[PDB]
Design a binder for this molecule. Sequence first.
Ligand SMILES: [Mg+2]
Ligand SMILES: [Mg+2]
Ligand SMILES: [Mg+2]
Ligand SMILES: [Mg+2]
Ligand SMILES: [Mg+2]
Ligand SMILES: [Mg+2]
Ligand SMILES: [Mg+2]
Ligand SMILES: [Mg+2]
Ligand SMILES: [Mg+2]
Ligand SMILES: [Mg+2]
Ligand SMILES: [Mg+2]
Ligand SMILES: [Mg+2]
Ligand SMILES: [Mg+2]
Ligand SMILES: [Mg+2]
Ligand SMILES: [Mg+2]
Ligand SMILES: [Mg+2]
Ligand SMILES: [Mg+2]
Ligand SMILES: [Mg+2]
Ligand SMILES: [Mg+2]
Ligand SMILES: [Mg+2]
Ligand SMILES: [Mg+2]
Ligand SMILES: [Mg+2]
Ligand SMILES: [Mg+2]
Ligand SMILES: [Mg+2]
Ligand SMILES: [Mg+2]
Ligand SMILES: [Mg+2]
Ligand SMILES: [Mg+2]
Ligand SMILES: [Mg+2]
Ligand SMILES: [Mg+2]
Ligand SMILES: [Mg+2]
Ligand SMILES: [Mg+2]
Ligand SMILES: [Mg+2]
Ligand SMILES: [Mg+2]
Ligand SMILES: [Mg+2]
Ligand SMILES: [Mg+2]
Ligand SMILES: [Mg+2]
Ligand SMILES: [Mg+2]
Ligand SMILES: [Mg+2]
Ligand SMILES: [Mg+2]
Ligand SMILES: [Mg+2]
Ligand SMILES: [Mg+2]
Ligand SMILES: [Mg+2]
Ligand SMILES: [Mg+2]
Ligand SMILES: [Mg+2]
Ligand SMILES: [Mg+2]
Ligand SMILES: [Mg+2]
Ligand SMILES: [Mg+2]
Ligand SMILES: [Mg+2]
Ligand SMILES: [Mg+2]
Ligand SMILES: [Mg+2]
Ligand SMILES: [Mg+2]
Ligand SMILES: [Mg+2]
Ligand SMILES: [Mg+2]
Ligand SMILES: [Mg+2]
Ligand SMILES: [Mg+2]
Ligand SMILES: [Mg+2]
Ligand SMILES: [Mg+2]
Ligand SMILES: [Mg+2]
Ligand SMILES: [Mg+2]
Ligand SMILES: [Mg+2]
Ligand SMILES: [Mg+2]
Ligand SMILES: [Mg+2]
Ligand SMILES: [Mg+2]
Ligand SMILES: [Mg+2]
Ligand SMILES: [Mg+2]
Ligand SMILES: [Mg+2]
Ligand SMILES: [Mg+2]
Ligand SMILES: [Mg+2]
Ligand SMILES: [Mg+2]
Ligand SMILES: [Mg+2]
Ligand SMILES: [Mg+2]
Ligand SMILES: [Mg+2]
Ligand SMILES: [Mg+2]
Ligand SMILES: [Mg+2]
Ligand SMILES: [Mg+2]
Ligand SMILES: [Mg+2]
Ligand SMILES: [Mg+2]
Ligand SMILES: [Mg+2]
Ligand SMILES: [Mg+2]
Ligand SMILES: [Mg+2]
Ligand SMILES: [Mg+2]
Ligand SMILES: [Mg+2]
Ligand SMILES: [Mg+2]
Ligand SMILES: [Mg+2]
Ligand SMILES: [Mg+2]
Ligand SMILES: [Mg+2]
Ligand SMILES: [Mg+2]
Ligand SMILES: [Mg+2]
Ligand SMILES: [Mg+2]
Ligand SMILES: [Mg+2]
Ligand SMILES: [Mg+2]
Ligand SMILES: [Mg+2]
Ligand SMILES: [Mg+2]
Ligand SMILES: [Mg+2]
Ligand SMILES: [Mg+2]
Ligand SMILES: [Mg+2]
Ligand SMILES: [Mg+2]
Ligand SMILES: [Mg+2]
Ligand SMILES: [Mg+2]
Ligand SMILES: [Mg+2]
Ligand SMILES: [Mg+2]
Ligand SMILES: [Mg+2]
Ligand SMILES: [Mg+2]
Ligand SMILES: [Mg+2]
Ligand SMILES: [Mg+2]
Ligand SMILES: [Mg+2]
Ligand SMILES: [Mg+2]
Ligand SMILES: [Mg+2]
Ligand SMILES: [Mg+2]
Ligand SMILES: [Mg+2]
Ligand SMILES: [Mg+2]
Ligand SMILES: [Mg+2]
Ligand SMILES: [Mg+2]
Ligand SMILES: [Mg+2]
Ligand SMILES: [Mg+2]
Lengths: 271, 46
Amino acid sequence: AVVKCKPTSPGRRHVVKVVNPELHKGKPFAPLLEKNSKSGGRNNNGRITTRHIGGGHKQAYRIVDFKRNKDGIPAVVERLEYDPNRSANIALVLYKDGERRYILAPKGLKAGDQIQSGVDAAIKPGNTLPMRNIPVGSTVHNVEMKPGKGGQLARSAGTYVQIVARDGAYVTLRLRSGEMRKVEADCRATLGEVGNAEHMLRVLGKAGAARWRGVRPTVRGTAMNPVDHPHGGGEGRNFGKHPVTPWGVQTKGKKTRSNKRTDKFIVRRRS
Amino acid sequence: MKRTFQPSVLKRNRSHGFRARMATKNGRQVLARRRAKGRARLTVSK
RNA sequence: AGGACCGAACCGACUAAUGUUGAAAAAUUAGCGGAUGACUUGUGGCUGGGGGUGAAAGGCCAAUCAAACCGGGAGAUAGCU
RNA sequence: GCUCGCCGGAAGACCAAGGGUUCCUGUCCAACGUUAAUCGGGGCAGGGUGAGUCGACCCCUAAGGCGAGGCCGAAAGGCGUAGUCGAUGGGAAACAGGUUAAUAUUCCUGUACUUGGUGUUACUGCGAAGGGGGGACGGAGAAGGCUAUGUUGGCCGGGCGACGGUUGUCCCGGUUUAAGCGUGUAGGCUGGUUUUCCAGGCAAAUCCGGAAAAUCAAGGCUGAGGCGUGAUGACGAGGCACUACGGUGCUGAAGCAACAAAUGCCCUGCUUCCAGGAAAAGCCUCUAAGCAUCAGGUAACAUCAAAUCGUACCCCAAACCGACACAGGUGGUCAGGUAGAGAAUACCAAGGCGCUUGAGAGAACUCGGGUGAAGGAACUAGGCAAAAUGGUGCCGUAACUUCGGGAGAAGGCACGCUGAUAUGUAGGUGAGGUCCCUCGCGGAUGGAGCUGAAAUCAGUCGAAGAUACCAGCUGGCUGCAACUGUUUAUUAAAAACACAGCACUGUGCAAACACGAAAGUGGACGUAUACGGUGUGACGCCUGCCCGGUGCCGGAAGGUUAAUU
RNA sequence: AAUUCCUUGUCGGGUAAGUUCCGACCUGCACGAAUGGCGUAAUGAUGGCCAGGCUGUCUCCACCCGAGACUCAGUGAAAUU
RNA sequence: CUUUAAUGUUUGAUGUUCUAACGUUGACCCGUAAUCCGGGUUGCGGACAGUGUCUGGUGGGUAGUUUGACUGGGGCGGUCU
Ligand SMILES: [Mg+2]
Ligand SMILES: [Mg+2]
Ligand SMILES: [Mg+2]
Ligand SMILES: [Mg+2]
Ligand SMILES: [Mg+2]
Ligand SMILES: [Mg+2]
Ligand SMILES: [Mg+2]
Ligand SMILES: [Mg+2]
Ligand SMILES: [Mg+2]
Ligand SMILES: [Mg+2]
Ligand SMILES: [Mg+2]
Ligand SMILES: [Mg+2]
Ligand SMILES: [Mg+2]
Ligand SMILES: [Mg+2]
Ligand SMILES: [Mg+2]
Ligand SMILES: [Mg+2]
Ligand SMILES: [Mg+2]
Ligand SMILES: [Mg+2]
Ligand SMILES: [Mg+2]
Ligand SMILES: [Mg+2]
Ligand SMILES: [Mg+2]
Ligand SMILES: [Mg+2]
Ligand SMILES: [Mg+2]
Ligand SMILES: [Mg+2]
Ligand SMILES: [Mg+2]
Ligand SMILES: [Mg+2]
Ligand SMILES: [Mg+2]
Ligand SMILES: [Mg+2]
Ligand SMILES: [Mg+2]
Ligand SMILES: [Mg+2]
Ligand SMILES: [Mg+2]
Ligand SMILES: [Mg+2]
Ligand SMILES: [Mg+2]
Ligand SMILES: [Mg+2]
Ligand SMILES: [Mg+2]
Ligand SMILES: [Mg+2]
Ligand SMILES: [Mg+2]
Ligand SMILES: [Mg+2]
Ligand SMILES: [Mg+2]
Ligand SMILES: [Mg+2]
Ligand SMILES: [Mg+2]
Ligand SMILES: [Mg+2]
Ligand SMILES: [Mg+2]
Ligand SMILES: [Mg+2]
Ligand SMILES: [Mg+2]
Ligand SMILES: [Mg+2]
Ligand SMILES: [Mg+2]
Ligand SMILES: [Mg+2]
Ligand SMILES: [Mg+2]
Ligand SMILES: [Mg+2]
Ligand SMILES: [Mg+2]
Ligand SMILES: [Mg+2]
Ligand SMILES: [Mg+2]
Ligand SMILES: [Mg+2]
Ligand SMILES: [Mg+2]
Ligand SMILES: [Mg+2]
Ligand SMILES: [Mg+2]
Ligand SMILES: [Mg+2]
Ligand SMILES: [Mg+2]
Ligand SMILES: [Mg+2]
Ligand SMILES: [Mg+2]
Ligand SMILES: [Mg+2]
Ligand SMILES: [Mg+2]
Ligand SMILES: [Mg+2]
Ligand SMILES: [Mg+2]
Ligand SMILES: [Mg+2]
Ligand SMILES: [Mg+2]
Ligand SMILES: [Mg+2]
Ligand SMILES: [Mg+2]
Ligand SMILES: [Mg+2]
Ligand SMILES: [Mg+2]
Ligand SMILES: [Mg+2]
Ligand SMILES: [Mg+2]
Ligand SMILES: [Mg+2]
Ligand SMILES: [Mg+2]
Ligand SMILES: [Mg+2]
Ligand SMILES: [Mg+2]
Ligand SMILES: [Mg+2]
Ligand SMILES: [Mg+2]
Ligand SMILES: [Mg+2]
Ligand SMILES: [Mg+2]
Ligand SMILES: [Mg+2]
Ligand SMILES: [Mg+2]
Ligand SMILES: [Mg+2]
Ligand SMILES: [Mg+2]
Ligand SMILES: [Mg+2]
Ligand SMILES: [Mg+2]
Ligand SMILES: [Mg+2]
Ligand SMILES: [Mg+2]
Ligand SMILES: [Mg+2]
Ligand SMILES: [Mg+2]
Ligand SMILES: [Mg+2]
Ligand SMILES: [Mg+2]
Ligand SMILES: [Mg+2]
Ligand SMILES: [Mg+2]
Ligand SMILES: [Mg+2]
Ligand SMILES: [Mg+2]
Ligand SMILES: [Mg+2]
Ligand SMILES: [Mg+2]
Ligand SMILES: [Mg+2]
Ligand SMILES: [Mg+2]
Ligand SMILES: [Mg+2]
Ligand SMILES: [Mg+2]
Ligand SMILES: [Mg+2]
Ligand SMILES: [Mg+2]
Ligand SMILES: [Mg+2]
Ligand SMILES: [Mg+2]
Ligand SMILES: [Mg+2]
Ligand SMILES: [Mg+2]
Ligand SMILES: [Mg+2]
Ligand SMILES: [Mg+2]
Ligand SMILES: [Mg+2]
Ligand SMILES: [Mg+2]
Ligand SMILES: [Mg+2]
Ligand SMILES: [Mg+2]
């Protein structure tokens, strides 16, 4: 539900916020939290490695079950919560033996639902099965790459993967970039799409609204001096150069992937 | 008009103190240069 | 509710006069801008010189910066005074 | 010593950092003090810092530092596991009065509290490097209840006034009391109790979690303040006796009530919003290994111990950072009266000061101010400077607009004092008395006393009633940038940078990219609705032709083409 | 025209008089569509122009109040040569 | 000798399969109280990836340097036997 704010201030004029009234209002679950600290883009040598990072609100880390590992024990969803560490929501589930866990929230999941994992689960959203047991053509999320490693594909909000073809011990998938990839059929995947599909309709509205997310200003390369950026210099607005990165590499059109170990799993690229 | 020297004993000892000179290889040669010269006071620690 | 309105503390520095062997190696006096936020502040910590950091002025890095300070090559070289 | 002036949200008082004898007493005036000096933060000598409860030390951790093994590296060395350090954060306990020339929550007087050790007695299962709970946490807003504190009245002691009046509805002063202990209040949160079972908490559990019944409905936790006690005490106006004119000792009256009231407390509460808001120990509980007449655990009483280091003084500054006894800089705390919306501003209280050269004179000229005939920007690069407006309540208000604004648009009227409505109004707060009660810090009813705006009518004084300090100048056309913001510490604050928004492009995760001879790390405990690079810069209407040149992307039939043989 | 040399182009408005300003013409030395084109309410210690009030800015200066300058006592520099 | 097929040697290249070198930032057990490291069981890749020597291309990312003289001042123009 996207609601436009009335222009009672210059900074409130263009803001569009996504509000979900079913999210939990109180505090999160205590035993499943941790501590993470900001880095500021600095690595163990102290230097800046990633630019335009630093500041923002304080956050905690929520332990989410990316493996969906325990089988044969049904669970019932209790509440949908807001996770500051990702763009999707999460759901707190209560297992039949009395154990609680955090999972990604599929689209159309509400409190009181039933979820199940393993090889003898039903084909309903929020169920985890190996891809041998999933019909060809199904739409799945939280896809694995190596059996037992945990989910790594289609974890953002509104994304999904498409099962295109099964060939022996390998299944072919269509990723959100429109890329075909082969994955061992022993890997697991959760049925359905990821929730929060309205995430992309939001508009921040003002400069300060991006500083609450730890994003610092970006200075254009052409606004610097020649010593700083290969784009710098000029009496007025002079460019006369082929655009490049701050370190001197073509920034438009030049492919940068050089990986030969895992080219045999790519069927065709995004293009 | 704030000046450049703002005293603090804790940060003076943590930077130029004796136990900080002897932790690194190049800091121990500072002491050997001041022992050879003949300094009455080696480090700042007083 | 508000990177909302007027205005003290607090943070700045647009105009004018004085000062210029100054009270002060950047201030004083009268007005001035922001003032619940991209705010301001205490303590501790991290990034080291062809390097750091930079809402980008070649700015800042101990009154020193189109390449800091100290010691060394070193009594560099000087068709010039 | 008597007067005068100045500060009083500080130019008063207290902490922290930093300094180190500047602190107090005796003594001296050579050098130091922008002058003299009998004076001093100056010279010489002596004296002064007293802790179970304040701080450090100590137990525990954040960012981060080191790091047995270990991985890497010409050597030096780099990163890091188990560990071990590291506050700016978490963990037990004391308050009132008196005293010294100089210390006191440390000494003395009165009344308290905490944590361990040992001994006696009585009951009993204890036990961790392990499980669970708790510690434990955001921004903003609003109301209720209180307190600090203040004003007035009552009470007590004193006065009857240098010049008209002052035995009264007159004047001055005082009216103070803590931690601790009992009570569990305004209020906040929460359903209790008993049986059976379980794929969970790495094994176990009676603990936490989950499931199924039966029974009762009030049980429990937290909590400002008030009251009683502490306290037949201490303190206290004042009087009295000496004095070595500094001060010593004795006695000591009253010590109540109403109203107003915080930015402080209940409140780590309540409501709400998105940007979703530390860790570990102290503490509670549960069992495993082991012991089981033992060791242990709980309780009452007795008794012992709490070591070591700091403690003087500077109080936003003559002692700290500025070479100076320098119109500079320095984190936190306290917060009286009248006027006021106010921590602004004016005058004062407690308190502290008059800024370490003076005495005359009353020229030009310079600096900071006051007033000005007629004119009113004619000055000038330019209304630079100066002059001018300035508060509250009500009436009224254009083009344009992204429908919020423009707008405090523009402009206008009223404003003092006295009397009445009303011997003080609407309102606020509230003691008796009556009734009820599960009896209490209770419920209803009741209204003495206290406080009290705003308005209307009438009269009245001045040249002037927002009378001082304080406190917008307004309007019309146009370039640039959408807006708040950032920038050349010290001649440039802007049209320059950023910005939300848009587009291209790279990246399938051991991701692209960056710091690194490498190991590793950031990106990210993220996964294409995500991340990096480049350009443009809200929004509205739009973004046309050119691939010859340079660059980039895709293809490999043919020519040339390295090491190699 | 933040762009236009010739150029104070030409026409209109405003002034007694307007190289600046507002509105148009097109002859664009040498505008032009994300090194974005044309508009745009609100915002600005932003550049230009015109009005009302107000005045010592000015015609053209005059007087007054304090701090120096001047004389007396104490201390007592500097650039330069 | 040309055009040619055949038995047979030299192997150059093109795929397919295999596991034992090699990789694993998949799962599990131990050192061990430990998300590093090492050893073992297993799955998945597999003579590919990657690294050392030699070598063709690209390479202002970085470094060292050059860029003449005469001249009615220097540049522009002209000149240098
Ligand atoms: Mg580190
Ligand atoms: Mg951007
Ligand atoms: Mg620049
Ligand atoms: Mg360059
Ligand atoms: Mg240009
Ligand atoms: Mg060009
Ligand atoms: Mg504001
Ligand atoms: Mg403003
Ligand atoms: Mg303001
Ligand atoms: Mg003002
Ligand atoms: Mg300036
Ligand atoms: Mg100025
Ligand atoms: Mg101000
Ligand atoms: Mg000022
Ligand atoms: Mg600091
Ligand atoms: Mg650099
Ligand atoms: Mg940088
Ligand atoms: Mg420049
Ligand atoms: Mg250099
Ligand atoms: Mg030398
Ligand atoms: Mg020399
Ligand atoms: Mg030499
Ligand atoms: Mg005064
Ligand atoms: Mg004041
Ligand atoms: Mg000290
Ligand atoms: Mg001394
Ligand atoms: Mg003395
Ligand atoms: Mg003398
Ligand atoms: Mg003297
Ligand atoms: Mg002395
Ligand atoms: Mg203590
Ligand atoms: Mg310590
Ligand atoms: Mg650590
Ligand atoms: Mg290390
Ligand atoms: Mg080692
Ligand atoms: Mg420790
Ligand atoms: Mg501390
Ligand atoms: Mg504590
Ligand atoms: Mg005591
Ligand atoms: Mg004495
Ligand atoms: Mg004292
Ligand atoms: Mg005491
Ligand atoms: Mg005592
Ligand atoms: Mg005593
Ligand atoms: Mg625990
Ligand atoms: Mg805390
Ligand atoms: Mg809250
Ligand atoms: Mg009271
Ligand atoms: Mg009289
Ligand atoms: Mg008389
Ligand atoms: Mg009285
Ligand atoms: Mg009394
Ligand atoms: Mg209650
Ligand atoms: Mg514990
Ligand atoms: Mg003291
Ligand atoms: Mg002090
Ligand atoms: Mg003071
Ligand atoms: Mg002085
Ligand atoms: Mg001073
Ligand atoms: Mg006051
Ligand atoms: Mg006022
Ligand atoms: Mg005079
Ligand atoms: Mg004058
Ligand atoms: Mg006049
Ligand atoms: Mg007159
Ligand atoms: Mg007149
Ligand atoms: Mg006039
Ligand atoms: Mg004129
Ligand atoms: Mg003129
Ligand atoms: Mg002015
Ligand atoms: Mg004025
Ligand atoms: Mg307007
Ligand atoms: Mg103003
Ligand atoms: Mg113009
Ligand atoms: Mg702007
Ligand atoms: Mg600045
Ligand atoms: Mg400047
Ligand atoms: Mg879009
Ligand atoms: Mg893309
Ligand atoms: Mg731009
Ligand atoms: Mg645009
Ligand atoms: Mg185009
Ligand atoms: Mg082309
Ligand atoms: Mg072509
Ligand atoms: Mg090509
Ligand atoms: Mg011109
Ligand atoms: Mg005309
Ligand atoms: Mg004119
Ligand atoms: Mg005319
Ligand atoms: Mg004019
Ligand atoms: Mg004309
Ligand atoms: Mg003019
Ligand atoms: Mg025009
Ligand atoms: Mg035109
Ligand atoms: Mg053209
Ligand atoms: Mg242009
Ligand atoms: Mg373009
Ligand atoms: Mg533009
Ligand atoms: Mg335009
Ligand atoms: Mg405007
Ligand atoms: Mg601004
Ligand atoms: Mg203007
Ligand atoms: Mg006009
Ligand atoms: Mg005028
Ligand atoms: Mg006038
Ligand atoms: Mg004149
Ligand atoms: Mg003077
Ligand atoms: Mg001399
Ligand atoms: Mg294989
Ligand atoms: Mg290979
Ligand atoms: Mg190879
Ligand atoms: Mg170069
Ligand atoms: Mg050389
Ligand atoms: Mg020459
Ligand atoms: Mg010549």
